[PDB]
């Protein structure tokens, strides 16, 4: 752009006026708000700032330069691109083990901004072998360094399309297993988010989270004083129970069911929602796991949410109950319990406000309840299905056949099959 | 039962103001 003698003194060989200029740029880029990154970029000072991060540059020069480049990288994607194109990332990484503690926090912050920009830059940071120096930071004690490193670590684990290199990010699991025992709240939060990202994938990824003894602590963190800790911990727990029955049983054995019960009455609506989603994944298991959910007294608050909670939460409670109802074939007492807890009317009432998908989910639940009813009255020699009466007395029999008006060709068959078979 | 659902139906960039 324009600057002399602030760019020239930046290009000076005098180490003092090199620092004085860099500090000026840093103070400018440290946005109270809204900071003039573009005019700093077009001033052509970025490549020089990158030079100041070289191995044997003065410490305070490395610090101020990395700080300045950090804020430039915190801007738009195009502004972050400028830092990347200046080959600054490999120097950020080198400072993670060469620089002092203060310099390390600057560098790891910058890498967080770069990795948080896109999946491309996230992968690029990983391709530059950043993981090993980053994991080395957690050998340090300074809380502020640990806090920032954990944040950057979560940024490297985040993203699904595409997901990061598993062979790389999975190396952070033993470190994350320790980080969730931290006394620092913000460190806890980001560590739990990082785990939720890693636990989101195939059974191999889930098993890796299990093998480092993480689930036990996650369940304990569900009762943390802060909802900022509970939410990512719940997300991670919810991800693990998306695996097979064995992996789901581990979470149950860690005492997740009583914890989930308390979360059903959480002030945060989305915590309620994902608690129901988690339970629904567990009720989605085998007979004994559905029974465990029942024995943990989870159904009554679920039924209560199925009728009075917001739709996004209500639809998740539907999944939980609808799943559990499927189990009623192998154990009819499951259906008997569900019906006795008054689930039929909230299910039926949901049919007239739900999505095309949730209605289909609800219809399967009601069908499982009905199918159990006929199986029982046939084996006991009765003339009337009381579950069919319960539905009719709840006024849902009509709602069942107010769903064939619906133009989806398969909300259509079950709806009238129910009416044709039971009514 | 019938499932599982991987999904139910943090802060990308930060500035250093010290």
Curated annotation (Swiss-Prot), chain A:
Region of interest (NLS binding site 1), ranges: 123-249
Recorded GO MF terms: disordered domain specific binding; nuclear import signal receptor activity; nuclear localization sequence binding; protein-containing complex binding
Protein's GO biological process: import into nucleus; NLS-bearing protein import into nucleus; proteasome localization; protein import into nucleus; protein targeting to membrane
Major site of localization recorded for this protein: cytoplasm
Impact after mutating residue 30 to F: In SRP1-31; temperature-sensitive mutant; reduced growth rate and chromosome loss
Residues covered by region (NLS binding site 2): 333-419
GO CC terms: cytoplasm; cytosol; NLS-dependent protein nuclear import complex; nuclear envelope; nucleoplasm; nucleus; perinuclear region of cytoplasm; protein-containing complex
Annotated effect of mutating residue 133 to Q: In SRP1-1; temperature-sensitive mutant
UniProt superkingdom: Eukaryota
Compartment(s) of residence: Cytoplasm, Perinuclear region
Subunit: Forms a complex with an importin beta subunit. In the nucleus, interacts with NUP2 which accelerate release of NLSs, NUP2 is subsequently displaced by CSE1:RanGTP which mediates re-export and recycling. Interacts with HEH2, SHE2, and STS1.
Comment, domains: The NLS binding sites are mainly involved in recognition of simple or bipartite NLS motifs. Structurally located within in a helical surface groove they contain several conserved Trp and Asn residues of the corresponding third helices (H3) of ARM repeats which mainly contribute to binding.
Family: Belongs to the importin alpha family.
Role played: Functions in nuclear protein import as an adapter protein for importin beta nuclear receptors. Binds specifically and directly to substrates containing either a simple or bipartite NLS motif. Promotes docking of import substrates to the nuclear envelope. Together with importin beta KAP95, mediates nuclear import of transcription factor GCN4. Together with tethering factor STS1, targets the proteasome to the nucleus.
Additional note from the record: Binds to nucleoporin FxFG but not GLFG repeat regions. Ran-GTP can disrupt the karyopherin heterodimer by binding to the beta subunit and releases both subunits from the docking site.
Protein name as annotated: Importin subunit alpha
Source organism: Saccharomyces cerevisiae (strain ATCC 204508 / S288c) (Baker's yeast)
Location of this fragment in the whole protein: 88 to 509 of 542
UniProtKB/Swiss-Prot annotation, chain B:
Subcellular location: Nucleus inner membrane
Biased composition (Basic and acidic residues): 11-18
Coiled coil segments of this chain: none
Function statement: Plays a role in sister chromatid separation.
Protein name listed in UniProt: Inner nuclear membrane protein SRC1
Species this chain originates from: Saccharomyces cerevisiae (strain ATCC 204508 / S288c) (Baker's yeast)
Lineage of producing organism: Eukaryota, Fungi, Dikarya, Ascomycota, Saccharomycotina
Name of the gene this protein is made from: SRC1
Covered residues, full protein: 172 to 195 of 834
């Amino acid at each position: 752009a324009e600057l002399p003698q602030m760019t020239q003194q930046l290009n000076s060989d005098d180490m003092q006026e090199q620092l004085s200029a860099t500090v000026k740029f840093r103070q400018i880029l440290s946005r109270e708000h809204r900071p003039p990154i573009d005019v700093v970029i077009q001033a052509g000072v970025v490549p020089r700032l990158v030079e100041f991060m070289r191995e044997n540059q003065p410490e305070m020069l490395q610090l101020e330069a990395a700080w300045a480049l950090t804020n430039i990288a915190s801007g738009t994607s195009a502004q972050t691109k400028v830092v990347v194109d200046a080959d600054a990332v490999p120097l950020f990484i080198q400072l993670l083990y060469t620089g002092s503690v203060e310099v390390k926090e600057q560098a790891i912050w910058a890498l967080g901004n770069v990795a948080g920009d896109s999946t491309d830059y996230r992968d690029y940071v990983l391709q530059c072998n950043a993981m090993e120096p980053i994991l080395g930071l957690f050998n340090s004690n300074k809380p502020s360094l640990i806090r920032t490193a954990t944040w950057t670590l979560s940024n490297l684990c985040r993203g699904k399309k595409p997901q990061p290199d598993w062979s790389v990010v999975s190396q952070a699991l033993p470190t994350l297993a320790k980080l969730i025992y931290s006394m620092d709240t913000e460190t806890l939060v980001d560590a739990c988010w990082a785990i939720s990202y890693l636990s989101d994938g195939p059974q191999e990824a889930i098993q890796a989270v299990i093998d480092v003894r993480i689930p036990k602590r996650l369940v304990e963190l569900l009762s943390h004083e802060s909802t900022l800790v509970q939410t990512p911990a719940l997300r991670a727990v919810g991800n693990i129970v998306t695996g097979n029955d064995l992996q789901t049983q581990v979470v149950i054995n860690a005492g997740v069911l009583p914890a989930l019960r308390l979360l059903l009455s959480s002030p945060k609506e989305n915590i309620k929602k994902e608690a129901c989603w988690t339970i629904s994944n567990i009720t989605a298991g085998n007979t004994e796991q559905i029974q465990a959910v029942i024995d943990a007294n989870l159904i009554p608050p679920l039924v209560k949410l199925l009728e009075v909670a917001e739709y996004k939460t209500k639809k998740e409670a539907c999944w939980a109950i609808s799943n559990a109802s499927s189990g009623g074939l192998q154990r009819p007492d499951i259906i008997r319990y569900l019906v006795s807890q008054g689930c039929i009317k909230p299910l039926c009432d949901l049919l007239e406000i739900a999505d095309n998908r949730i209605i289909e989910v609800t219809l399967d639940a009601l069908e499982n309840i009905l199918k159990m009813g006929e199986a029982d009255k046939e084996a006991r020699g009765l003339n009337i299905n009381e579950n069919a009466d319960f539905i009719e007395k709840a006024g849902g029999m009509e709602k069942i056949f107010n769903c064939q008006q619906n133009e989806n060709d398969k909300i259509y068959e079950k709806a009238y099959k129910i009416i044709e078979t039971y009514f | 039962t019938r499932k599982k659902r991987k999904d139910p139906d943090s802060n990308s960039k930060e500035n250093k103001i010290d």
